[PDB]
Amino acid sequence: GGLTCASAPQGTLRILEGPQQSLSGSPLQPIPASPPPQIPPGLRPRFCAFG
Amino acid sequence: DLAPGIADSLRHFKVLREKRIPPWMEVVLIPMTGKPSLYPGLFLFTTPCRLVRPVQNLALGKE
């Protein structure tokens, strides 16, 4: 138990978690565009001129 | 070389609510441009009183 000074280390291992990327890199999934306003069907001339 | 990976992992954890990361966390990575840009660093904010708004993360498909 003299606890002498040992030599300098050769290198460094570093352990850390890696993320999973099987999900991302996929084609994007955007929010679907709301439709442009379309005229309602069944619009008729309700007003007829008097006389 | 690891900091965009950590920033994307934290956004992934945030939007999927996985590792008790709050959904109101700001994961800011100011990149090292080598030019007089903003001071770089990975800044993480979870404190109150910040303004925050919903967008949709297109990679995850969630808000």
Swiss-Prot record, chain A:
<protein>
    <recommendedName>
        <fullName>DNA-directed RNA polymerase I subunit RPA34</fullName>
    </recommendedName>
</protein>
<comment type="subunit">
    <text>Component of the RNA polymerase I (Pol I) complex consisting of 13 subunits: a ten-subunit catalytic core composed of POLR1A/RPA1, POLR1B/RPA2, POLR1C/RPAC1, POLR1D/RPAC2, POLR1H/RPA12, POLR2E/RPABC1, POLR2F/RPABC2, POLR2H/RPABC3, POLR2K/RPABC4 and POLR2L/RPABC5; a mobile stalk subunit POLR1F/RPA43 protruding from the core and additional subunits homologous to general transcription factors POLR1E/RPA49 and POLR1G/RPA34. Forms a heterodimer with POLR1E/RPA49. Part of Pol I pre-initiation complex (PIC), in which Pol I core assembles with RRN3 and promoter-bound UTBF and SL1/TIF-IB complex.</text>
</comment>
<feature type="modified residue" description="Phosphoserine">
    <location>
        <position position="34"/>
    </location>
</feature>
<feature type="modified residue" description="Phosphoserine">
    <location>
        <position position="26"/>
    </location>
</feature>
<comment type="similarity">
    <text>Belongs to the eukaryotic RPA34 RNA polymerase subunit family.</text>
</comment>
<comment type="function">
    <text>Component of RNA polymerase I (Pol I), a DNA-dependent RNA polymerase which synthesizes ribosomal RNA precursors using the four ribonucleoside triphosphates as substrates. Involved in UBTF-activated transcription, presumably at a step following PIC formation.</text>
</comment>
<feature type="region of interest" description="Disordered">
    <location>
        <begin position="18"/>
        <end position="41"/>
    </location>
</feature>
<feature type="compositionally biased region" description="Pro residues">
    <location>
        <begin position="29"/>
        <end position="41"/>
    </location>
</feature>
UniProtKB/Swiss-Prot annotation, chain B:
<protein>
    <recommendedName>
        <fullName>DNA-directed RNA polymerase I subunit RPA2</fullName>
    </recommendedName>
</protein>
<comment type="function">
    <text>Catalytic core component of RNA polymerase I (Pol I), a DNA-dependent RNA polymerase which synthesizes ribosomal RNA precursors using the four ribonucleoside triphosphates as substrates. Transcribes 47S pre-rRNAs from multicopy rRNA gene clusters, giving rise to 5.8S, 18S and 28S ribosomal RNAs. Pol I-mediated transcription cycle proceeds through transcription initiation, transcription elongation and transcription termination stages.</text>
</comment>
<comment type="subunit">
    <text>Component of the RNA polymerase I (Pol I) complex consisting of 13 subunits: a ten-subunit catalytic core composed of POLR1A/RPA1, POLR1B/RPA2, POLR1C/RPAC1, POLR1D/RPAC2, POLR1H/RPA12, POLR2E/RPABC1, POLR2F/RPABC2, POLR2H/RPABC3, POLR2K/RPABC4 and POLR2L/RPABC5; a mobile stalk subunit POLR1F/RPA43 protruding from the core and additional subunits homologous to general transcription factors POLR1E/RPA49 and POLR1G/RPA34. Part of Pol I pre-initiation complex (PIC), in which Pol I core assembles with RRN3 and promoter-bound UTBF and SL1/TIF-IB complex.</text>
</comment>
<comment type="similarity">
    <text>Belongs to the RNA polymerase beta chain family.</text>
</comment>
